[PDB]
Curated annotation (Swiss-Prot):
Protein name: NAD(P)H-hydrate epimerase
Record: residues binding K(+): N67, D135, T173
Pfam families xrefs: YjeF_N
Phylogenetic classification of the source organism: Eukaryota, Fungi, Dikarya, Ascomycota, Saccharomycotina
Localization of this protein: Cytoplasm; Mitochondrion
A single BP term in Gene Ontology: nicotinamide nucleotide metabolic process
Any single GO CC term annotated in Swiss-Prot or TrEMBL for this entry: mitochondrion
Coiled coil residues, start to end: none
Example GO molecular function: metal ion binding
Family that this chain belongs to: Belongs to the NnrE/AIBP family.
Cofactor note: Binds 1 potassium ion per subunit.
Organism of derivation: Saccharomyces cerevisiae (strain ATCC 204508 / S288c)
Note in the entry: Present with 1380 molecules/cell in log phase SD medium.
Catalytic reactions of this protein: (6R)-NADHX = (6S)-NADHX; (6R)-NADPHX = (6S)-NADPHX
Cofactor(s) the record lists: K(+)
Length: 243
């Protein structure tokens, strides 16, 4: 149960995409989004389920930053994996080119992308229509207080989180990245998919209530050790590891 502070997490990302290492946001985001999709597929296998059961959708809520981007990637892989993903993308930064491209990729795969209005997103918070919800609102760079419409979105999610499973990307939206859940109501994810390395707030989950996965398989030993942790033992060619 090793974790990295939000401060070091920012330093890691900065170094990974720095001139020395040379990683591009496109690569990391693609790999990260892939991880999340793989966790969803592993947690909610389609084998066995009836056609009616398979008709349910995977409701992906994308935030305006990096976390949301990871969600846009996740949605495309889920479509390829055989699921029926639906994306709710309320606030889009019209200055980040890659996010726009990720949306075009979703259109290419015929994955619905709802707006903050026209999409009546609330219809997807009903048990008979949604298999699980992917929480890709805010990542480790989150800093309270939370503003609308994300505040209200989290409220709506908390009302049905005990009936519909929520899969949180990197960290549970609304939680203090280092201190843990503070504000109430608070997200209680059925699954948490930490990216690169889990943050301090991850030690606040309950194993009986939340399954924990770590994703983002692109960290060498010496680099990890430099930041206080050991690279995770991903099995086979998996892009996720349980715990
Ligand atoms: Cl973010």
């Amino acid at each position: 149960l090793k974790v990295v502070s939000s401060k070091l997490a920012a330093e890691i990302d900065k170094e990974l995409m720095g001139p020395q290492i040379g990683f591009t946001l496109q690569q990391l985001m693609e790999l990260a989004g892939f991880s999340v999709a793989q966790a969803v597929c592993r947690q909610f296998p389609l084998r066995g389920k009836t056609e009616t059961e398979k008709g349910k959708h995977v409701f992906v809520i994308a935030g305006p930053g990096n976390n949301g981007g990871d969600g846009l990637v996740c949605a495309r892989h889920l479509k390829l994996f055989g699921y029926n993903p639906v994306v709710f993308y309320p606030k889009r930064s019209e200055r980040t080119e890659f996010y726009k491209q990720l949306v075009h990729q979703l259109n290419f795969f015929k994955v619905p992308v709802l707006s903050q209005d026209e999409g009546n997103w609330l219809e997807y918070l009903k048990p008979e229509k949604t298999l699980c919800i992917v929480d890709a609102i805010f990542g480790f760079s989150f800093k309270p207080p939370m503003r609308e419409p994300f505040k209200g979105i989290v409220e709506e999610l908390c009302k049905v989180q005990n009936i519909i499973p929520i899969v949180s990307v990197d960290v549970p939206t609304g939680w203090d990245v280092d201190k843990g859940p503070i504000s109430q109501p608070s997200i209680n994810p059925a699954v948490l998919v930490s990216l690169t390395v889990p943050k301090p707030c991850s030690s606040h989950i309950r194993e009986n209530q939340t399954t924990h996965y770590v994703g983002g398989r692109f960290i060498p030993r010496d680099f990890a050790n430099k930041f206080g942790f050991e690279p995770f033992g991903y099995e086979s060619t998996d892009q996720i590891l349980k715990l």
